[PDB]
Amino acid sequence: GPRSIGTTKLRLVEFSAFLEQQRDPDSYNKHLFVHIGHANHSYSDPLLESVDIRQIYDKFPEKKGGLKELFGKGPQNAFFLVKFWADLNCNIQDDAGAFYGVTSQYESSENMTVTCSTKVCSFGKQVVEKVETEYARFENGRFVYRINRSPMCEYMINFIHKLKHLPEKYMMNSVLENFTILLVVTNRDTQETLLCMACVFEVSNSEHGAQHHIYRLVK
């Protein structure tokens, strides 16, 4: 299916988590750890593959406010599992004014105030969380919500450093297998769920770089 994640009501169309480094006075480097620029699934099938949500409940928060309760309230067509391949091939330099950032953009057909909740989870339990509020800007026929260049929390900067100091790729894949992120976008005025993305992670292979694969969550 498509490269962006969601429905007409709300689509995540741009996303990246990155490191910017100023090496010299007139030059800088930017490295992307994850992004939604390179779909791993085919654009030729218009239909997305599906994944039974019951088999990912233990990788995300549970009980009150957890994934099963969110999915039960619906709309079920707003729920996706997104697998990200992370590109960790980056030289983290000493004294380089490094900025670790996250950028995202959503689009909607409706003019809304939205609440974006990011829950970073370890073994299915929330370790840190961020809630952002964004307001629509009308652009070329749609409402656009931009979270530009937001700093990464210290937990994630430290996690990335820990991950890169591991001696083997399989150990990085092991650690990423228990690391998940739950993204929930809600209409702040009606409390309706607009988009829910359950994110899982693996290390990118060889020189294929960062990629993502979208699944609709069903059952």
Nearer CB in complex with its own copies: 121/185: 185
Q: Nearer to its own copies by C-beta: 3 or 188?
A: 3
C-alpha to C-alpha distances, 145 to 15, 50, 104, 193, nearest whole angstrom: 12, 27, 8, 16
Residue 113 interacts with which of its own copies, ligand A1IJL, none, CB < 5 to 8 Å by class: none
Residues 96 to 125 in contact with its own copies, rule: CB under 8 A: 103, 107, 109
Q: Which of 12, 15, 181, 199 binds its own copies (CB under 8 A)?
A: 15
Give the list of residues 6+ apart from residue 139 with CB closer than 8 angstroms, or none. Answer: none
Q: Which stretch binds its own copies (CB under 8 A): 2-10, 118-126, 154-162, 188-196?
A: 2-10
Smallest separation, CB 24 to its own copies (Å): 20
Quick one: 37 or 66, whose CB is closer to its own copies? 37
Which residues fall within 8 angstroms of residue 134, CB to CB, at 6 or more apart? 106, 113, 114, 116, 145, 146, 147
- Residue 38 CA to residue 36 CA, distance in Å, equals 6
Q: How far is the CB of 8 from ligand A1IJL (least distance, A)?
A: 20
4 vs 36: CA distance, rounded Å: 7
Nearer Cβ to its own copies (48/121): 48
Q: Write down the least CB distance from residue 158 to its own copies, Å.
A: 24
Question: For residues 60 and 79, which CB has a smaller minimum distance to its own copies in the complex?
Answer: 79
**Which tokens sit at 177?**
């297998």
| Residues ≥6 apart with Cβ < 8 Å to 215 | 48, 49, 50, 51, 80, 81, 82, 83
Cα radius of gyration (the chain): 17
| Of the candidates 156, 161, 152, the residue with the CA atom closest to the CA atom of residue 104 | 152
Q: Under the rule (CB under 6 A), what is the footprint of ligand A1IJL?
A: 17, 33-34, 84, 86, 88, 102, 118, 120, 128-130, 150-153, 156, 160, 163, 176, 181, 199, 201
